Structures are given as structure tokens and as C-alpha cells.
Amino acid sequence: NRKIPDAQVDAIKVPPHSLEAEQSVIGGLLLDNERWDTVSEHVMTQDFYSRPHRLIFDGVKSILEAGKPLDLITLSEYLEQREQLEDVGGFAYLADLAKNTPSAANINAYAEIVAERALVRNLIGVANEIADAGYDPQGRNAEDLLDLAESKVFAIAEARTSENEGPKNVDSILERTLERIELLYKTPQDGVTGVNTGFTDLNKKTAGLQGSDLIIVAARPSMGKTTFAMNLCENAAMEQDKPVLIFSLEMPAEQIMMRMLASLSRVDQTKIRTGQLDDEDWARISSTMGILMEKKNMYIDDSSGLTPTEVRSRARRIAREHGGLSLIMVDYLQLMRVPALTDNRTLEIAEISRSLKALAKELNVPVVALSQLNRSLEQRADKRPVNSDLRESGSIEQDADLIMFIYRDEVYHPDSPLKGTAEIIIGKQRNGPIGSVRLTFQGHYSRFDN
Amino acid sequence: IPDAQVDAIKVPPHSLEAEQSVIGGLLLDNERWDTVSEHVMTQDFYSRPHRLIFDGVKSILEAGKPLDLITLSEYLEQREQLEDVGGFAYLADLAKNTPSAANINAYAEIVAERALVRNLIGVANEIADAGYDPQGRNAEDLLDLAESKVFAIAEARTSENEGPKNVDSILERTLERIELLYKTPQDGVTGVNTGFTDLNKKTAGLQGSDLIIVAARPSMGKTTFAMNLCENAAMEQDKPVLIFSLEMPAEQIMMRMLASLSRVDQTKIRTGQLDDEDWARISSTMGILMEKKNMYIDDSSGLTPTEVRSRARRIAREHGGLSLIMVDYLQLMRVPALTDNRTLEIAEISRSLKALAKELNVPVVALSQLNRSLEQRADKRPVNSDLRESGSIEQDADLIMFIYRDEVYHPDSPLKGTAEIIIGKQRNGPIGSVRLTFQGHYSRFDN
Amino acid sequence: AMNLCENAAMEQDKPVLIFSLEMPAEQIMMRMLASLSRVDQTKIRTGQLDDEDWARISSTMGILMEKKNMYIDDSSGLTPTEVRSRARRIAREHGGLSLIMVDYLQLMRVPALTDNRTL
Amino acid sequence: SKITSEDARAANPRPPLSEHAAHVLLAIADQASDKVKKRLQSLARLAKANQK
Amino acid sequence: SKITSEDARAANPRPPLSEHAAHVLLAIADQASDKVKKRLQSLARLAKANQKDD
Numbered sequence A: 001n002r003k004i005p006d007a008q009v010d011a012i013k014v015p016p017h018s019l020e021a022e023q024s025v026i027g028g029l030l031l032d033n034e035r036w037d038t039v040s041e042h043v044m045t046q047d048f049y050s051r052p053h054r055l056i057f058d059g060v061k062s063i064l065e066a067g068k069p070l071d072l073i074t075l076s077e078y079l080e081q082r083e084q085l086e087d088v089g090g091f092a093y094l095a096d097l098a099k100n101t102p103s104a105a106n107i108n109a110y111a112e113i114v115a116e117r118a119l120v121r122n123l124i125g126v127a128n129e130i131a132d133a134g135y136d137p138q139g140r141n142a143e144d145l146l147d148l149a150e151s152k153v154f155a156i157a158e159a160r161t162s163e164n165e166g167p168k169n170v171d172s173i174l175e176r177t178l179e180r181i182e183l184l185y186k187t188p189q190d191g192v193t194g195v196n197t198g199f200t201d202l203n204k205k206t207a208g209l210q211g212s213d214l215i216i217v218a219a220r221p222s223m224g225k226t227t228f229a230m231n232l233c234e235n236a237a238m239e240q241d242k243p244v245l246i247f248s249l250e251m252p253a254e255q256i257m258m259r260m261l262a263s264l265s266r267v268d269q270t271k272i273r274t275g276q277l278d279d280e281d282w283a284r285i286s287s288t289m290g291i292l293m294e295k296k297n298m299y300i301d302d303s304s305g306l307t308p309t310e311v312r313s314r315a316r317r318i319a320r321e322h323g324g325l326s327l328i329m330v331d332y333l334q335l336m337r338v339p340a341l342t343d344n345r346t347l348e349i350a351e352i353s354r355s356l357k358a359l360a361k362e363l364n365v366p367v368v369a370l371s372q373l374n375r376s377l378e379q380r381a382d383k384r385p386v387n388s389d390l391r392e393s394g395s396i397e398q399d400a401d402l403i404m405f406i407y408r409d410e411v412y413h414p415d416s417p418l419k420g421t422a423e424i425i426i427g428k429q430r431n432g433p434i435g436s437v438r439l440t441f442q443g444h445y446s447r448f449d450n
Numbered sequence B: 001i002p003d004a005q006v007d008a009i010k011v012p013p014h015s016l017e018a019e020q021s022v023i024g025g026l027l028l029d030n031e032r033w034d035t036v037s038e039h040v041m042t043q044d045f046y047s048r049p050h051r052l053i054f055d056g057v058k059s060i061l062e063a064g065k066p067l068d069l070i071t072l073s074e075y076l077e078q079r080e081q082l083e084d085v086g087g088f089a090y091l092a093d094l095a096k097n098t099p100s101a102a103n104i105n106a107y108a109e110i111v112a113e114r115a116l117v118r119n120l121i122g123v124a125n126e127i128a129d130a131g132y133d134p135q136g137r138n139a140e141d142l143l144d145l146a147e148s149k150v151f152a153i154a155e156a157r158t159s160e161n162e163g164p165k166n167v168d169s170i171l172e173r174t175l176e177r178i179e180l181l182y183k184t185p186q187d188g189v190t191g192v193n194t195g196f197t198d199l200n201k202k203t204a205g206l207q208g209s210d211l212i213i214v215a216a217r218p219s220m221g222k223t224t225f226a227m228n229l230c231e232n233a234a235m236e237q238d239k240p241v242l243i244f245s246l247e248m249p250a251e252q253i254m255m256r257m258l259a260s261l262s263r264v265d266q267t268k269i270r271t272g273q274l275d276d277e278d279w280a281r282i283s284s285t286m287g288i289l290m291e292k293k294n295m296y297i298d299d300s301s302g303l304t305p306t307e308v309r310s311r312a313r314r315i316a317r318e319h320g321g322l323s324l325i326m327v328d329y330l331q332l333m334r335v336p337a338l339t340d341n342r343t344l345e346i347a348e349i350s351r352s353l354k355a356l357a358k359e360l361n362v363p364v365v366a367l368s369q370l371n372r373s374l375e376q377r378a379d380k381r382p383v384n385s386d387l388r389e390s391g392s393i394e395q396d397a398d399l400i401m402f403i404y405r406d407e408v409y410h411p412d413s414p415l416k417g418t419a420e421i422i423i424g425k426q427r428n429g430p431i432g433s434v435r436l437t438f439q440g441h442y443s444r445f446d447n
Numbered sequence C: 001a002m003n004l005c006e007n008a009a010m011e012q013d014k015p016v017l018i019f020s021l022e023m024p025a026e027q028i029m030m031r032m033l034a035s036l037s038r039v040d041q042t043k044i045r046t047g048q049l050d051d052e053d054w055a056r057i058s059s060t061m062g063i064l065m066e067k068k069n070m071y072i073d074d075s076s077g078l079t080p081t082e083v084r085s086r087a088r089r090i091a092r093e094h095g096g097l098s099l100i101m102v103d104y105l106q107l108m109r110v111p112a113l114t115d116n117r118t119l
Numbered sequence D: 001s002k003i004t005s006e007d008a009r010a011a012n013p014r015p016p017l018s019e020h021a022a023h024v025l026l027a028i029a030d031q032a033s034d035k036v037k038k039r040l041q042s043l044a045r046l047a048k049a050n051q052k
Numbered sequence E: 001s002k003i004t005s006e007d008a009r010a011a012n013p014r015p016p017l018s019e020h021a022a023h024v025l026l027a028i029a030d031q032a033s034d035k036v037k038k039r040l041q042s043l044a045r046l047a048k049a050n051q052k053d054d
């Protein structure tokens, strides 16, 4: 029983490592300084297990970043200046590192091994931290511990998310371009290549709601911004097998559903609210409900003050159940929060916009985000909304792939000949033309028609 | 021996007390099984004896048999498990040590929470073991394994208590809401009566959970309008009206209320020149107000959203709810954490009041001032942009009402004595305008 | 700016480096194809290319592939340090660069100066 | 004022539930899950008519 | 009527691929790297002979 713990302590206390790969990376850089650009993309100083190798690698990094030639003497002088040469094993050990790896062109493979070992080392460290938190919660509830575990594991995965993206040569872009064209040609392209908007005129200009697109729908209050976005959701839910995810930060799920019922059933929204539904109204609502229940392809999250991380987490959860998502709608971008950027609202909104674009690319799903137009527009009130009206609220234009504005002349001019008509202005579009689409606005039904 | 044992915590998270309370509570009521069974499973119990006892409870109740100490003891005796749980005495002790009912759901949540942490620790150990001994799995495979096991823990606690997100849950809540509306008299008003027919036609009353912003330029009758809503709620509802008068004292609010309900000249009340008829009307009005006792006036200055919420909860507990909450001037409130930014401070107050409205299921009326820039234009009616310049309160408001009096800007207006109530924003109804008779002498709005 | 890049790519042996912070690499290439081939951009987008249009696009592609003197980096929110690092990497492979194009200056970020956009 | 208040059509709301609505609610309850079926039957039970 | 009233250029899509395009795609594939060569050959394979007018 006394010989059992010594072998177990030696085999369990040593984390995964590769001293040989670490030595080969260092030795290889001493042989060919030009490989630093590639090696620096794979490994960081903290990726090394051995303390002496971290100090040596830090020296290598400092010399090469300064544009100085990396050799045994230069590195030794660097470490000597910081009184770290004795801590790494002396000049003899540096010479041994250069001697023990006479082979070049394999340095990238050794860098990947060092990075892989560091990843497992970080994973074990996180597992121990989570275990410690589980044993000693220090006042944290189960939900907080689950969120902590998810956050720490997600951080490990995020670090290894886009590791080898640097080199972007024309041959690679041509292959991806042809692959994309091939995919479009294989799918039925009768004017719509993405998620159907339900509006022919809009689809003619946008070719549908594209995957990976961050779409900003902006309007002044009561222009039908929520109404328009919901019609896009309704169309995606009725035409796609994949689910629609709605983050209703302003309105409750019951209210969104009631408006949806008013829209799909073409029943007066006021009648639904007041309960004065006739036999015909009940039959239409019931038929609509029957279809919605048959489809079951819609999720409504009415949680307030969600962070981009929480939005991403919930989206991934649902996407895993169905092998993807048809559309993600975020009710009001400005209602989201970023605890790290509370000191600056503009930067906070800019980060939310960047995070939602990253979410769109990550899940290959169109992300519709609703935004409010700046108050300065009402002072002018002479022309249609423009991109500058949104720039004043967080520079969201830079991250958006598509910007759509909602304008109703009847709101500003009740005697307008365009009563019941809403203009959808394309303010920005990466994969199509800019312009305007006229839609029939039916406020009583909370619906837009072509 | 003890130093290493004290440092090492081999005991996983558990709550024997909560487990005993769940078992003891079910022995006391039986009908609570449907709720408890939604939160806890037999495996959620840490203690082996409690798992066996709970399994017995589950079997008896699922069979529709009455659960009592004798029935449970006989059940366990048939399976030779009675000795394994501590005997009849331990079952009797479990029923004795929890004499309190209505907290069984809270204990069930604690047991479930502990089981969740217990499963999490188990998964963490499995991941640690996989990390130490990968058995031929690469780092990517270990990461996928860790993600899969953690996702499995999260999925078990996804949609536990009705899980609001899926269509089945929304359908149930939709039908429950329709049922509630149909049970209450719906003669055009589904919420708190405004006292104005034309306004009720558009709003269907003041809805529960709504944050209502009433905005007006000075002397447009903003306080007057909000108080008429309070007076109507106080006279038509059994639940109390709570007023946070941050600008005016309680005596002044009451005097204006007396002028309104009694239709006695406000100046006469102030000056004391009341005739016999005036005294009789004021006295009758006072008699009714005292009989109702359904109004609270808090005239404390510089209240924080937390203080407002705290006082509202205190009163709501006494009456099982509130009919209406009125906050005199949103801008007069304070947020000590956001003193560096007035816009953010006002935005937080607006968010907090909306949260308060949802928390207590009560309409919250908050008075706001229109921006000074409107007077520079003075060519059209107030709009939502006039409020956005003062804290972006539009985003949080469920209903925005503006007060406009043409006679204030144009004394020779043909609309003398008429005030226009503009619906600038409405979530559950149409936008538009309602004309009301403004009687400044009585501090009253009429239909 | 892209016509300047196209001319530099066709007339110089050294590579052209493009930091497209707003548009993806596929979109930049499609616009380049429309430019060098003198084919209607809408036709390229819609796929309604005639025999003549295909021949011109194909010839242009053949030349671009033969030259291989262009790099497109479509990474968003790049820092000046990252831009400098990637530029040096490519320059080392060819003994220099012919031209560096940065799509929108305002789209870049400086984590140390988040408190002031002008600075 | 009475003219101004009741001008656009007489507003006499009469919302008692019809036997027809109760019948359709029960028809839906036959296709609904047990949880929804109970709520639909409850709503149909609340529907009063008793004609003939 | 909406189409006729707001017609931003005649949208007549004619996408049949020509044998000529397939030939040029294969000619480029000869100079392309293995990864690009496979995509160009795949695109040329997708090109169907829809010749007409004669």
C-alpha cells in the first residue's frame, strides 16, 4: 500500500507535454529565423510546459519582433542582460537545443504538437477549477456554476477557433469562389438563393436573406419595424424546415405570438386584443395555430438584457438540435448589454454589432437585428432615412452586410397619396443593389404585403 | 490523519434537510406530488435511504393510492427495504421534522440544484480522467467529448418548469390568457379603466405590466391627467393605487384631487372661500375616499428605483396586488451608480420601472417632460423624438401619451378648453389622438 | 482603388496586398472580373453570361492565375499591428510589395485608444 | 360632447360566447395534446348559449 | 402592374451554359493547382450544350 501512491503521484501530477517538440521549435528558429512568422501563428510563450523553454522562447520572440537576427550568441546575451541565462541552464543548454534538432521544415509540425499539449494542459486546469468550484461553491448557485463551466470551456474552444487563417493566396480564393458558384448552381435559383423574404420585389433585389449576413432593420418609432422583421420570420418559418430563433428583448412572447396570429390569419389585431372575435375570426386563428403547431419550427426567447455571449450560447443550443437555423432575429440591438464596455455606449453597441456578425458567420445563418434611427432625423424631417442616421448610434454600418430602412410618408404627412404604403429603403447591400421597395402596410393586421 | 482529511473534501454537494423536507412534505399533503415530480427525480437524492423512500412515494402516488406513513412502511417492508432506510422510526421522524407546508417546491429545487452540481462534478472528473488518459483520442475529440457531456447536463435542465420558448408552452399560456379575459367583464376595457371612453376605445384600458409615459410641456395638465387616471382606478378597483409624488407634497395632491372629484374651484379650496354647496360636495367626496382607503401617497424626494420597488412590494403584499403605480416625474429619480451620465441614469430608471410593471403585473404611469427644443420649433404636435433627447425612454415604454393644448400656444384658438391626448407609441393598440375637455379650474379632464 | 490594384498587379512582379475590411474576398474578385473582362457586373451576379462573356472572364482568370501576384485578406477589425505583421510576412516571400490597399481606415481598431475615436 | 363621444357608429359591445365557439374548441381539443386539450375543454365549458 | 410601374431595367434571366464556357474552364484547369483544377472540371461538367438559333 506504500508503493501505490508514489507511482500514482508521478503519473498523475505530470500534465501532458513534449519537451522534444519544444526543443525542436526553439532549435529550428535558431537555424532559420524566417520561420518565426509561421511558428508565431501556432504557439504562444505560455504554450511551453517547461519554465526554461518559456524564457528562451520569450527571448526568441523579442529579438525576432525587433527585426534582429536570432543566433545562439544574441539569444544568450539577451538572457544574460535579464539575469535569466542561469535560469534556463546556461549557454551550454542553448547550444544543446540548436544541436539536438538538425532538421528543418518540420518546425510547424512541432509547433502544432506544442500547441496541442498546451490545449490539453489548459483543459485539465479548467476541469480542476470546475471541480474545485463544484466542491466549494463559495456562495454560487448551480446555475452560476453551470455558466462558469460553460464560459471556461467556451474560452478554451474560442482560442483554437481561427488559428491558421493568415496566408490568403489567390489560388485558395479561386477554389472557394468556384465551390460557392457550384453550390448555388446545384440549388434551385429561381431568383432566391438564401432565405425567402416573402416579398417578390425585395427578393428581386436581395436574392433572399443570405447565410452569414448581418441585417440591420432600422426605423423611427411606429414605422412597423417589428412588424416587418416578424413577417420575414413568418415566411422563413413557413418555407424552411430549419427553426427560426427570435430574441424578443422588448416584447413578451405572448405579444409576439398575438401579432403573428393577427398577421397570418389576417384578423384585426384590436379584435384579438379585445376578444371580440366572430365565428370567422376564430376559424382563421384556429387554422393558423394548427399549422404553427404542425411546423414547430419557431423559438421565442423573451429574456431581457442579454449579452452577445448568452445570445450565441442559446443559438448554438437550438442549432445543434436541428443541424442548423433558418433565421436569427434580435429585436433591439441597443437593448443588449456588454458588462465589459459599460463605460462607453457607442463601443458597447459596436461590439454587439461585431459579435452578431461573428454569430452569423459561425452558424451560417442570416441574423436580423432591429435598430432605432437617431433623433436628429426628426429635426430634419425633409428626406428619407440615410446611413448617417445609424452611424450616430454605434457605427453599426461597418459591420452590417445589409441595411434596410422603413419609411412611411403617411406618418409624417397624413394627407399623403401613399396611404397604406411603406417604403423599404436598401441603405447598404454587399451582394446586391441599393434602392427602394414599396410594400403595402396593413397596421390592422400587423402585416406587410407585396 | 485529520489535517489531510480536513483539507480533502470527498463529500459531494447535498442537502439531507431538503431531501427530508420533500419526503416529509409529500407525507403531509399528497396533492403536491404533481409539482414535486416536475422538479426532482429519484436519482436526484444523495442519500441511499432517501432514494428508496422517494421511490416508494413515487410508486404509491402514481398508482393513485393515498400516501401515509403506514402505506409507505408496508410498501418498503414488502421489498425488504424498510431496514435499509432506517426502519419505521426514521419514516416517522421524516414526517415529524418538517411540519411546514408550501415550501416543498423550494426544497425540491434545492435537491435538484444539488443533483445538478453532483452530476457536474462527476462530468468534470470524467473529463479530467480523459485528459490524463486519452486512450487514443486527439485533443479535438476530447474537446468534443467535454462539450457533449457539459451540453447533456445543460439539456436536462432546459425546460423544467413549463420552459417558455417552445410552441406547446406558448399555446397553453395563450389559452390561459384568453380564458382570464373571457371571465372578466370585457365591455371594451380589459385592463384598468382610464375613465375616458374615447381613450379606452383605443387602449382597452391601462394594461398590467405596461410602462406608460405621459409627457407634456409645463402647464399642459400632465399631473392633472395622470391623477384623473389614478382617481378612476381608485374608484373602480378594489386593489390600491400607489402614488410617488416626487415634486408635490401629499397635501397638495389631495387638494387637487378634492377639486377634481368634487368639481369645486381649486382657487376656492386654496383661498378657503367655499360656499355651503362647495362644502357639501367636498365632504361627500372625502367620505367616499375614506370609505375606499385604496390610495397611498409617498412624497419622498430623490427616490431610487430600488426604493420605489421596495415600497411598492410592501403595499402589494397587504392587498394581494396593486391597481396602478404612478411616478410623478421620472427625471426626479436618482441612480447613485450612474451619476456620471444623466442619459444612462434616466434609461436605467425607465428599464427598472418596466421591470417593476412586469414583476407586480401592474400598469406603471411615469410622468416625463418634453425637451426644450420643441419650443424652438413650436410648429407641430409633440413627437417621440422630443422624448428621445431626454434618456431614450421610448424603447422601454409600452404606451406613450402626449398632452397638447392649442390654447396655451394660441390663446385665440377655437379649441379653448380642449386638450389633445396624442398616442405616440402603443404596443397593444392603435396610435392616434383623443380630444378631452380640460377644466383647469377643477384640475380635471372630462370625456 | 481596385483599378489601381489591378494595374499594379498586371504591371509589377511584386505582389499586391489587399485588406478588405468591409467586403469579402469573393466579392472583390467578382468586381475585379467585371473590371478586367469588361463584362456587366449584374450579368456576373445573375449568372446570365453569354458565350462571349464566358470567354472574356476565362481569359482574365487565366492571366490572374498565371501572375499570382495578389493577396486578399478579408479579416474584420484588424489592428495596425496585425496589418503590419501580415504585410511583412508576404513581403519576405517576394523581397517586397508593389502596393498595400486598406479598404476603410475607420473600420480598423486600436484597443489602447477605445476612449477616443479621433485619436 | 355626447355627439363627439359616440359619433363613429354606436359602440355597444356584446361579447357573450357562442355555442359554435364551444363546438370548434372541442373539435380542436380532439387533435390537441393532453395539456392543450384540458385548456380547450375548459374554455368550451366556459362558453354559454343553451338555445332551444 | 407594380412591376410595370417600378421596372428598374428588364430582368430577363438567360442562364444556359455554353459548350464554349466548358472548353475555356477546362483550358484554365490545365494551368490551375489540383484544388482549383477539380472545381473548374466540376463547373465544366455542369456546363450543358444548349446550342440553338441554327
Ligand SMILES: Nc1ncnc2c1ncn2[C@@H]1O[C@H](COP(=O)(O)OP(=O)(O)O)[C@@H](O)[C@H]1O
Binding pocket: A219, A220, A221, A222, A223, A224, A225, A226, A227, A228, A269, A270, A443, A444, A445, A446, B426, B427, B428, B429, B430, B431
Ligand atoms: N390595433 C391597431 N390597429 C392599427 N394599427 C395598429 C394597431 N396596433 C398597432 N398598429 C400599428 O402597428 C405598428 C407597430 O409598430 P412597431 O413595429 O411595434 O414599432 P417600432 O417601429 O418602434 O418597432 C404601428 O405602425 C402602429 O400604428
Ligand SMILES: Nc1ncnc2c1ncn2[C@@H]1O[C@H](COP(=O)(O)OP(=O)(O)O)[C@@H](O)[C@H]1O
Binding pocket: B216, B217, B218, B219, B220, B221, B222, B223, B224, B225, B266, B267, B440, B441, B442, B443
Ligand atoms: N386656480 C387655477 N385656475 C385655473 N387653472 C389652474 C389653476 N391652478 C392650476 N391651473 C391649471 O392647471 C394646470 C396645472 O398643470 P400641471 O399638471 O401641474 O403641470 P405639468 O404639466 O408641468 O405637470 C395648468 O394648465 C394650469 O393652468
Ligand SMILES: [Mg+2]
Binding pocket: A226, A250, A251, A331
Ligand atoms: Mg419591437
Ligand SMILES: [Mg+2]
Binding pocket: B223, B247, B248, B328
Ligand atoms: Mg407634477
